[PDB]
C-alpha cells in the first residue's frame, strides 16, 4: 500500500505560484509507484491534472495545465510534488495526490488505487 | 509480463467468459510484485463486485 498525505494548500493570487507536497508510506520502494495529482473544484468530478511515472523520469499534463504546472518525485524522501505558477481561477479546487499499484503512466482516475486526503488551493485577489 | 498475466488469468477461466473471481486472481497474482495488501486493494478499488473483468483490470490498474 502506499498512505498518502498532502501539503501546501492555501490561498494564492492569481498569475501566483504555490507548491503541493505529498508525502508516501509505500510498502514497496517509492520508484514502484506511478503518481498523480488530480483534482476536484466544488460539486464537479475529480480531474486529472498531471502525473509522473516511478522513477520520475517521465511526466504528463493536462491540457489545461501545460506549461504552468510541473510535477516532480523525489524517491529518497518519499514525496511528490506540484508546482502551481500562473494560477488562474480555473486552478481552485481540493488537489489530491494519487498512487496506482505500477510504475507505468495513467491519467485516468481508473488506474489508481490509493489516495491522499486532500487539500484546498483557492485562487483569489484576496 | 502482464501480457503474460493476462495469458494465466485466461488458463484459468474454464468456460472463456473473461471473468474471474478475486479470489482466483489473487491466488494466481501471488504466484506472479505486488504486496498481498496492495492485490486485495486493487482489485476492491477496481470493482465493488466478486466477479471481474480480468482483461479490463489489467488494462486499468496494471498497464
Redesign the interface.
Known amino acids: 500500500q502506499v498512505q498518502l498525505q498532502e501539503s501546501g494548500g492555501g490561498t494564492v493570487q492569481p498569475g501566483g505560484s504555490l507548491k503541493l507536497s505529498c508525502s508516501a508510506a509505500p510498502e514497496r520502494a517509492f520508484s514502484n509507484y506511478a503518481m498523480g495529482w488530480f483534482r476536484q473544484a466544488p460539486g464537479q468530478e475529480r480531474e486529472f491534472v498531471a502525473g509522473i511515472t516511478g522513477s520520475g523520469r517521465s511526466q504528463y499534463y493536462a491540457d489545461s495545465v501545460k506549461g504552468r504546472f510541473t510535477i516532480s518525485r523525489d524517491n529518497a524522501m518519499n514525496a511528490v510534488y506540484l508546482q502551481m505558477n500562473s494560477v488562474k481561477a480555473e486552478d481552485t479546487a481540493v488537489y489530491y495526490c494519487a498512487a496506482r499499484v505500477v510504475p507505468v503512466f495513467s491519467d485516468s482516475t481508473k488506474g489508481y488505487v490509493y489516495w491522499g486526503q486532500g487539500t484546498q488551493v483557492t485562487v483569489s485577489s484576496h | 509480463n502482464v501480457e503474460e498475466l493476462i495469458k494465466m488469468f485466461a488458463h484459468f477461466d474454464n468456460n472463456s467468459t473473461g471473468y474471474l473471481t478475486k479470489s482466483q486472481m489473487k491466488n494466481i497474482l501471488t504466484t506472479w510484485?505486488?504486496?498481498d495488501?496492495?492485490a486485495i486493494?486493487?482489485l476492491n478499488?477496481?470493482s465493488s463486485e466478486d466477479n471481474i473483468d480480468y482483461k479490463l483490470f489489467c488494462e486499468?490498474?496494471?498497464?
Not at chain 2, 486499468?60 to 498497464?63: A, E, K, R, T
Request: negative net charge; hydrophobic residues 55%; charged residues 25%.
Open positions: 510484485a505486488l504486496t495488501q496492495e486493494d486493487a478499488a477496481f486499468d490498474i496494471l498497464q
